[PDB]
Amino acid sequence: SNTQTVLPFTGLNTPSGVAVDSAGTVYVTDHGNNRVVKLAAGSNTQTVLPFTGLNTPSGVAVDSAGTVYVTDHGNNRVVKLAAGSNTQTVLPFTGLNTPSGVAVDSAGTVYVTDHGNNRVVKLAAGSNTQTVLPFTGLNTPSGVAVDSAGTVYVTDHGNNRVVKLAAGSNTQTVLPFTGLNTPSGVAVDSAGTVYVTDHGNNRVVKLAAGSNTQTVLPFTGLNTPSGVAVDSAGTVYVTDHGNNRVVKLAA
Template identity: 55%
Template sequence: MKTALLFGLLVILVGATGVSIKAMVSDRPAQESVVSYTSQVALPFTHLGQPWGVAVDAAGNLYIADHSSRQLMKLAAGADAPTPLPSEGLSDPTGVAVDGAGNVYVADNGNDTVWRLAAGADKLTALPIDGLEDPDGVAVDAEANVYVTDYSNRRVVKLAAGAASASVLPFGTLRGPVGVAVDSANNVYVTDNPAGRVLKLAAGTNEPAVLPFGSLHHPTAVAVDARDNVYVLQMNPDPVLKLAAGATIPTPLPIYVGSKAAGLAVDTDGTLVVTDFGEHKVVRLAPGARTTTTVSFTDLVYPNGVAVDGAGTVYVTGRGDNPVWKLGAGADTPTPLPFSAKTDPVGAAVDPAGNLYVADFDHRQLLKLASGARAPVPLPLNGIEYPAAVAADTAGNLYITDWTGNRVWKLTAGAEGPTMLPFSDLRDPQGVAVDAAGNVYVADSGNNRVLRMAAGSTTATALSLTDLNSPTGVAIDAAGDVYVADRGNNRVVKLAADSAIVSALPFTDLNSPQAVAVDTAGTVYVTDSGNARIVQLSPR
């Protein structure tokens, strides 16, 4: 098989159905509205080999170039299954494009050819573009002019509608053009893969401009939407970046490393489609609006723990003169709770009776502030070295992670001391959670995993969460979904109950998220420690 290049990207499916975000932090703007991508689903393409290029027409129909199967596929808008299109003669199809009349264009890397499948036709015809060597990307504008990245010849060619030969566009010195896109004004965009950049050639000009994406890591595909926002796919922990029209700084979209991806397309409403040839999937990421609002937390220096009770009251631990705070449901201003400034609080939990528990790390104790009490009291924790996190079940039993002792303890309600749970081979355990059935979950930070010990069991199993980097927080919702603060990757991921579907939640610009909590309504709270804020993600 003759292929110009194979690049791997990792994609994690985002399964949220739409959210709003609220950030609670001092010294930040009061409110800003942004457009985000909050719902990603796998499309019903089955038995794919290596889905590569992808295109979408104005009606929402998708076209996929299946590289290894040498097949062109179409998924009609709203359909449950794709249909194969005439593909005889294809060798190694890579890029695909579709024009306003429904004609489909395919860059065939193996045959050094660009093919056209006319709307309703039963066979492909070769376009008159001579001298191609490893063509990779293809695009078509509203006038049916065709643009092709000629990778090994380091050029971009244009075949004008009805022309008998192609011309070379003035992109200057390219090192390896791969992706190509064209906007409504016929400006042409190209990813120069080895050079790590995206170029724009404005219509009618002879010199391209480098777009301000910064130093990209092997950009493979580019797309532009109806509002002239530009999207690029790269090999990076932030694989998809969006450069809004007129902006000078790109924004990473919530698609995270999880498998290999090659193709990128965007439809008229801003929905992204990504081909994942490593997992033989095609995924779609839909846009949705969200609002970010800030609320001041006075003197909160370094937020660590977060907990939320059944009424929606949020409790936060941090550093400073007032190390523990309470924010009532619907309130805009938090109030400090009566904890000493000498307290070194990390994890926090609240039980059904409204009692608050705080792990005091430096003082090696667990503090309880009873509902309505004026001062906290220490609980009996003999044998625990450095408590890092705490969780409470519906019966009032407490679960504590011992960070340096590499153990997990249970303090039964009314007991005089804790008992050790049979977790083994822990390394710097931090977050802990317990579900309604009594199953215990631990963020085993040093081993980059999350463990689950079923109620009554003596052994723990690792959850199907890969690519974690120092997970520090864990929470469970009423449905049994698991949420993890993946500190080293600056993200929060969700593992759906009884499945292996992992979603990266659409938080943006996190910096060392430490803890996570979820309330009965499904609202997720995260301590964004590096940004000194608490972020709230609410379902719409």
């Protein structure tokens, strides 16, 4: 598609992260209003999730069980919300500073970009052990994503590059993007195609796996886009930070 649609969220203020579950429900961190809102496919009414005490929240992720994870960036913590019970719990990360992106893999392992510490950290389900991923040379990293093979992708926001670590691998590889300006969010679809919000260039770019040539998606009138997500149909969702809106573009 060459024609985006604006999702019927209301009253957003500088939205940051976006995620989408297997049912097409879209979750957005309403960063300027300290809340997380969700929108079911086809609905006009947004639902504010019962998160509590959020402070400039950044990233959001949703796993298979419907658990929602949010980086509480202003409180240097990551919180999650189990469906049904609606009890919020703080994940046992430690030593985070202005964390930004968050992602969850099929194993329930949670990855967070510890933006203030120039590192990426992961926490397995049920554990009190956090692992520092062996990325090197990170400068204010922003977004994080993980594909079905466990490969981790990070937007190295301060170095205008996107980096990835295969599962069990020790050395990162830099993706062949070009002309990136303060990249923000990253997403990866089921075929390994990587989508990056080129935040400083008001555009979203994508890169097929094993391709050396990027493509600019035909979004319209973005201003400093931040978060990006992709669903199983290839629909791309983008938080338009500067315009207080969320837009989507069918494949």
